[PDB]
Design a protein around this ligand. Structure first.
Ligand SMILES: Nc1ncnc2c1ncn2[C@@H]1O[C@H](COP(=O)(O)OP(=O)(O)O)[C@@H](O)[C@H]1O
Ligand SMILES: [Mg+2]
Length: 758
């Protein structure tokens, strides 16, 4: 009858007497024991049962908490590299402590990660005490800390950190000038609290490191000036199929003549082409004083309604600057990206991955597809008696909010604590105001000060408490019921709307009814709601409209509530399909980053840089030979003198009559002797430094240009097929060629500089 996780739970509960009656020292020793056993054969799995019991016993002694059996089940699923779905209040923090210890024994490190520094720091100091008791070191990585400090934190057996810091740290480690400046060790094991926020909602969120130089605007003015000379039908068309303004065949020929290009679509010209396309979208697609407006010397997006009158927001993909160039305004600069990674791409590098959260089931497929991780749903310790009521539907938001306030006021008069969840600050203010008019004391949490938020939330289950929380403000702080609150029905949770994703709704819902407590949840919606403007959602509302529904006769039916849930499943499914497709595109740059980072590390880790540099030189020399050896017009000889050697070093006299590979051996042998002489004049150690500064400069600067070009390639890929074949293959192929071209640039730059400078 009993399953794998239940069995192991019992195993650990059976041998509890074995650790129950040990002094602290004999108990702490178990850590040394386990280690001795590991290094001489035993696998981490072999020890799970005992190690878990040790932690289990140690927590009771330092915290007073003794992990429940469900917490033991969750612990196993985490060890297995899966996702433990454990409802809010099941004690995920203490639960994580089991697999973290086990997986830290081999001394390879474990990153424990959350959404903000308040939480990482709270959990570190609280769970740290258990680990330090077991003779383990615990580090805390924070944004305000120095390199040396970060290095120490990462050198601990266990490291707590935010996901942002881990990602930034990793990027900076790939920008260093010496190996020793790195702060991270290899990525061993990450256990991710709030795993759905981090691995799903932020899956594609890019972390970026910018340079301090301003991106040049030359291309913007060049493109703008070329576009002005264009003629309206001779040179361009609004393509119905692609929904865009494109150059005609004549326009491309004209652009190719105007600059010095053979083929405008060639990958080496992606930037030129894209700027031209934007300046073309800005000049004939964006009507001035219609699409946008100019305030002073700035440009503002109207937006339909405008709705956005003077928003501070701007158009993406260089479109904004293309308009500024058109409008003769100042081109507002943006710094260049030196390094980038998304969280999906970052966490995919760990040897092992695990995660825990209250809400993962609705994303089961997403975790499997993207991360190849199972969602293991762990039973609650106590039955869930919380009453989750079908949605209430109103005709107008005005009506909905009025009902929300009245609900809150009623529950307040009884003393029953109330938690109100909203999706936006403006809604929060709106509800708060309504409550002030009724004379109802309450607190507002606008997701700003995490530390203050947790203090308020700690108190939100006391008699007479009323708390308004915008977007899961104060997440990660359990809300306990005060004296006599059980008797009052527990925490009442009112949601003032539903998110596009049901998962986010469930997070709010789960804040009530913890550890078997009674409680009630109720969501409110209206015809005018944003979510209620969808395909299958709006139809239902349209009918209720015709039926004769009123703000004074809200609908509350199982059918309609299910219609809402189903419509959210459908939308989730669309989002998941888009995410799937975006991921495949992301993978092209992801793989290129891995190849170039490995090559860059090779450079700073290299015993002698000679071999790496020589190969670059030769590889580059071979391309010079081929370009002249399709009688042969050398040509090549003259070029060689100004690139790898000295004036008149090579000879016309050698011109020649030899097989090309023969020439390579001969010319490379001449290069090697010149190189040898340079090294002798520099001294070898000073030659290494010199080569290193050159190679890293070549790599760092061509990588930066490449990120910029790849981004432009992607933004405009829908114009490079050939619709409606799928552009993914076109992007992969062009991405591949552009990367090769980048590698070739790096090689040429290095070769020229070490040979010809200084
Ligand atoms: N085995 C246990 N015995 C008693 N209390 C526990 C146990 N495990 C966790 N708790 C407490 O229950 C509350 C829930 O903790 P937390 O880990 O934040 O829950 P969540 O799983 O929602 O993150 C905390 O106050 C924690 O100290
Ligand atoms: Mg937690």
């Amino acid at each position: 009858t009993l399953n794998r996780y239940e069995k192991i739970a019992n195993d650990i509960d059976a041998i509890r007497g074995d650790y129950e009656n040990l002094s602290d020292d004999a108990l702490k020793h178990k850590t040394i024991e386990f280690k001795e056993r590991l290094e001489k054969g035993a696998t981490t799995d072999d020890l799970l049962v005992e190690a878990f019991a040790v932690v289990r016993e140690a927590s009771r002694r330092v915290t007073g908490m003794f992990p429940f059996k469900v917490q033991l089940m969750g612990g196993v699923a985490l060890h297995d590299g899966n996702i433990a779905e454990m409802k809010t209040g099941e004690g995920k923090t203490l639960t994580s402590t089991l697999p973290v210890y086990l997986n830290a024994l081999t001394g390879k490190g474990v990153h424990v990660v959350t959404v903000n520094e308040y939480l990482a720091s709270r959990d570190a100091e609280q769970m740290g005490k258990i680990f330090e008791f077991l003779g383990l070191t615990v580090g805390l990585n924070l944004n305000s800390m120095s390199k040396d400090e970060k290095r120490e934190a990462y050198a601990a057996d266990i490291t707590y950190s935010t996901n942002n810091e881990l990602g930034f740290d990793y990027l900076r480690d790939n920008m260093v000038l010496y190996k020793e400046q790195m702060v991270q060790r290899p990525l061993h094991f990450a256990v991710i609290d709030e795993v759905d926020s981090i691995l799903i909602d932020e899956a594609r969120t890019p972390l970026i490191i910018s340079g301090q130089a301003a991106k040049s605007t030359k291309l913007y003015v060049q493109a703008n000036a070329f576009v002005r000379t264009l003629k309206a039908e001779k040179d361009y068309t609004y393509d119905i199929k692609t929904k865009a303004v494109q150059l005609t065949e004549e326009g491309m020929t004209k652009a190719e003549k105007a600059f010095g290009i053979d083929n405008l679509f060639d990958v080496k010209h992606v930037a030129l082409n894209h700027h031209i396309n934007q300046a073309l979208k800005a000049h004939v697609a964006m009507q001035k004083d219609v699409d946008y407006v100019v305030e002073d010397g700035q440009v503002v997006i109207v937006d339909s309604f405008t709705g956005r009158l003077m928003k501070g927001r701007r158009y993406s993909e260089g479109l904004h600057q293309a308009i500024e160039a058109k409008e003769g305004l100042e081109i507002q600069n943006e710094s260049m990206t030196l390094a980038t990674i998304t969280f999906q791409n970052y966490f995919r590098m760990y040897e092992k991955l695990a995660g825990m959260t209250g809400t993962a089931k609705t994303e089961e497929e997403e975790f499997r597809n993207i991360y190849n991780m199972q969602v293991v749903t762990i039973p609650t310790n106590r039955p869930v008696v919380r009453d989750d009521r079908p949605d209430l539907i109103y005709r107008t938001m005005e009506g909905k909010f009025k009902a929300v306030a009245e609900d809150v006021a009623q529950r307040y008069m009884t003393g029953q604590p109330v938690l109100v969840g909203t999706v936006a600050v403006e809604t929060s203010e709106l509800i708060s105001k309504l409550l002030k008019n009724k004379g109802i004391p309450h607190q507002v949490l606008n997701a700003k000060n995490h530390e203050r938020e947790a203090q308020i939330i700690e108190e939100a289950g006391q008699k007479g408490a009323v708390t308004i929380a915008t977007n899961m403000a104060g997440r990660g702080t359990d809300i306990k019921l005060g004296e006599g609150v059980k008797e009052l029905g527990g925490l009442a949770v009112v949601g003032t709307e539903r998110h596009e994703s049901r998962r986010i709704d469930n997070q709010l819902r789960g804040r009530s009814g913890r550890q078997g407590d009674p409680g009630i949840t109720q969501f409110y919606l209206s015809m005018e709601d944003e979510l209620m403007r969808r395909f299958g959602a709006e139809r239902t509302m349209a009918m209720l409209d015709r039926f004769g529904m009123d703000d004074s006769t809200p609908i509350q039916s199982k059918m309609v509530s299910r219609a809402v849930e189903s419509s959210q499943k459908r939308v989730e499914g669309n989002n998941f399909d888009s995410r799937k497709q975006l991921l495949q595109y992301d993978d092209v740059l992801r793989q290129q980053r891995e190849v170039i980072y490995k090559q860059r590390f090779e450079v700073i880790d290299s015993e002698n840089l000679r071999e790496i540099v020589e190969n670059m030189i030769k590889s580059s020399l071979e391309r010079a030979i081929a370009a002249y050896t399709p009688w042969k017009l050398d040509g090549l000889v003259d070029l060689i003198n100004t690139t790898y050697l000295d004036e008149g070093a090579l000879e016309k006299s050698d011109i020649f009559g030899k097989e090309p590979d023969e020439m390579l051996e001969l010319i490379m042998d001449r290069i090697i002797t010149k190189y040898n002489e340079k090294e002798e004049q520099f001294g070898k150690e000073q030659m290494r430094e010199f080569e290193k500064v050159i190679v890293l400069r070549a790599v760092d600067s061509k990588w930066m240009d490449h990120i910029d070009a790849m981004d432009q390639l992607r933004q405009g890929i829908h114009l490079r097929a050939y619709a409606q074949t799928n552009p993914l293959r076109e992007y992969q192929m062009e991405g591949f060629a552009m990367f090769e071209h980048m590698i070739e640039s790096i090689e040429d730059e290095v070769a020229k500089f070490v040979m010809k400078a200084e």
